[PDB]
Amino acid sequence: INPGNHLKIQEGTLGFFIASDAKEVKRAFFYCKVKKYDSTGMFHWCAPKEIEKVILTRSEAAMTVLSGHVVVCIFGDVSSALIGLRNLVMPLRASNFHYHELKHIVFVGSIEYLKREWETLHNFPKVSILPGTPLSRADLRAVNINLCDMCVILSANQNNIDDTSLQDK
Amino acid sequence: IEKVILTRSEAAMTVLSGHVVVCIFGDVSSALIGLRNLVMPLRASNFHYHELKHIVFVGSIEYLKREWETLHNFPKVSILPGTPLSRADLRAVNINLCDMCVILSANQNNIDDTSLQDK
Amino acid sequence: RTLVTGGATPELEALIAEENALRGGYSTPQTLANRDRCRVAQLALLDGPFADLGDGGCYGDLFCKALKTYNMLCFGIYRLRDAHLSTPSQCTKRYVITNPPYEFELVPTDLIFCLMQFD
Amino acid sequence: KHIVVCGHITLESVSNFLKDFLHKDRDDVNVEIVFLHNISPNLELEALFKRHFTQVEFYQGSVLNPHDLARVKIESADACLILANKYCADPDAEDASNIMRVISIKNYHPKIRIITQML
Numbered sequence: 001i002n003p004g005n006h007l008k009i010q011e012g013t014l015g016f017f018i019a020s021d022a023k024e025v026k027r028a029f030f031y032c033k034v035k036k037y038d039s040t041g042m043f044h045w046c047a048p049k050e051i052e053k054v055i056l057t058r059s060e061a062a063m064t065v066l067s068g069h070v071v072v073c074i075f076g077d078v079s080s081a082l083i084g085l086r087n088l089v090m091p092l093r094a095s096n097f098h099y100h101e102l103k104h105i106v107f108v109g110s111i112e113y114l115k116r117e118w119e120t121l122h123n124f125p126k127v128s129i130l131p132g133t134p135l136s137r138a139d140l141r142a143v144n145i146n147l148c149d150m151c152v153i154l155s156a157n158q159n160n161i162d163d164t165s166l167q168d169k
Numbered sequence: 170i171e172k173v174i175l176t177r178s179e180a181a182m183t184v185l186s187g188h189v190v191v192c193i194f195g196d197v198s199s200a201l202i203g204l205r206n207l208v209m210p211l212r213a214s215n216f217h218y219h220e221l222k223h224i225v226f227v228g229s230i231e232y233l234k235r236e237w238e239t240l241h242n243f244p245k246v247s248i249l250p251g252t253p254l255s256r257a258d259l260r261a262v263n264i265n266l267c268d269m270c271v272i273l274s275a276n277q278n279n280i281d282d283t284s285l286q287d288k
Numbered sequence: 289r290t291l292v293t294g295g296a297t298p299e300l301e302a303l304i305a306e307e308n309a310l311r312g313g314y315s316t317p318q319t320l321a322n323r324d325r326c327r328v329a330q331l332a333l334l335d336g337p338f339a340d341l342g343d344g345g346c347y348g349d350l351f352c353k354a355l356k357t358y359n360m361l362c363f364g365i366y367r368l369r370d371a372h373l374s375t376p377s378q379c380t381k382r383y384v385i386t387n388p389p390y391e392f393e394l395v396p397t398d399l400i401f402c403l404m405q406f407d
Numbered sequence: 408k409h410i411v412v413c414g415h416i417t418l419e420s421v422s423n424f425l426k427d428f429l430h431k432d433r434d435d436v437n438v439e440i441v442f443l444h445n446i447s448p449n450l451e452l453e454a455l456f457k458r459h460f461t462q463v464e465f466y467q468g469s470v471l472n473p474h475d476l477a478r479v480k481i482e483s484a485d486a487c488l489i490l491a492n493k494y495c496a497d498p499d500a501e502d503a504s505n506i507m508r509v510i511s512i513k514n515y516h517p518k519i520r521i522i523t524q525m526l
Contacts, residue, residue, distance in 0.1 A: 002405070036315070038312060038313055040297075040310075041319040043294065045312040090294060094294040
């Protein structure tokens with residue numbers, strides 16, 4: 001994706017294009033004239049961490065000034081399905097970013113549900129958890145949601161709910 | 170059980186040739202398949218001790234602990250926990266040089282699904 | 289996948305297929321040039337070097353200048369809803385413009401999609 | 408005038424509403440109690456509406472549809488009552504449903520008077 005001034009284009013490189021219709025792109029062919037990184041080396045890696053070193057409280061979060069972060073609220077419980085939160089964290093920790101240019105993450109959800117997915121996340125850096133529920137204004141203001149960069153909302157029990165209508169309420 | 174529990178590192182360290190592996194798909198709730206009657210013909214007495222085929226089990230530690238009470242007296246038995254579907258797990262026991270591989274299904278009785286049988 | 293996942297390469301695919309997880313590694317002079325890839329970012333044509341085209345600059349002129357200056361690929365525009373209307377307001381919501389034509393004016397309150405290289 | 412009643416309607420609930428709304432000692436009863444629900448009515452509700460010919464009506468369709476709300480013609484409604492289930496296993500789901508009804512109705516017409524229940 002966008003190499004610059006160090007690549008010479010070979011024959012039949014098959015570039016991708018953006019245009020209105022496939023007829024207009026046709027004019028292109030007819031031209032008239034320390035373990036910080038993963039083993040692969042693509043995502044930052046860290047030693048496994050116990051969940052008690054990342055579980056926070058309201059006072060801990062209020063002391064810990066978090067700015068320029070991402071808040072991912074989660075609705076769920078011990079009997080709901082799984083979303084694969086590792087699949088969400090993974091694109092956000094690429095080797096492209098520098099270590100101090102990364103984005104902090106917190107989770108505002110039920111710790112009992114989050115146990116079932118914490119075993120797939122301990123290898124990632126700069127992850128924090130705040131137990132509670134997203135509806136609590138105290139919990140929302142603890143993570144300084146005013147200064148956040150994005151506030152993702154999900155729902156683990158979206159599919160298996162009872163009522164056909166009234167979804168994601 | 171501690172004398173025979175293996176790990177991936179020492180499994181890679183050791184060398185096994187002409188052995189028999191066994192995969193077990195079970196847990197605590199699964200019924201006793203019964204495997205003493207499988208180990209015994211291999212640990213018979215007709216052939217000599219030097220020509221005896223080594224056995225390594227790949228299955229859940231809970232099930233194997235449940236069934237270990239009737240198997241510990243048979244010599245030259247090794248165990249390796251994990252899962253049989255993991256490519257690294259199978260690669261660690263030298264499948265290529267193995268004699269033959271067996272696969273069982275412990276919970277075959279209690280599964281009642283019309284499809285997905287022995288998936 | 290290689291644009292939005294972060295990386296979808298034969299090496300990582302083979303490693304994931306073999307292991308089903310990831311393992312920590314070590315830094316080397318090789319496999320560290322893999323960092324050089326383009327990410328996604330948004331500029332701000334108010335205090336940067338591109339603020340001089342924020343009045344009525346041509347989108348294609350800005351694109352060509354960005355390329356010939358810093359290899360700076362820009363192909364999307366984030367613009368306020370009532371930007372077309374001259375009546376001032378306090379609306380924050382912004383729509384998204386994909387592939388602007390060359391003869392395009394630039395509102396001074398514009399947010400521009402971008403990809404940037406690695407330093 | 409006429410009022411709109413939407414939500415969980417069942418024989419005992421509509422009886423409790425009717426026997427206290429259409430009592431003779433309350434002289435002003437000259438309002439039309441139009442109903443609203445998604446499922447088709449059954450049981451003796453039809454006979455109840457039959458004997459209460461000139462005082463009640465009924466309609467079919469959910470309350471979250473603006474076309475349905477236009478059909479019931481609440482644009483001139485004096486008020487809009489709501490009946491909420493109090494026997495549900497989960498109290499919070501029904502209460503979120505009531506909030507959903509309120510936001511839909513207020514989005515359609517932003518000045519009518521609503522008297523809703525809570526759990």
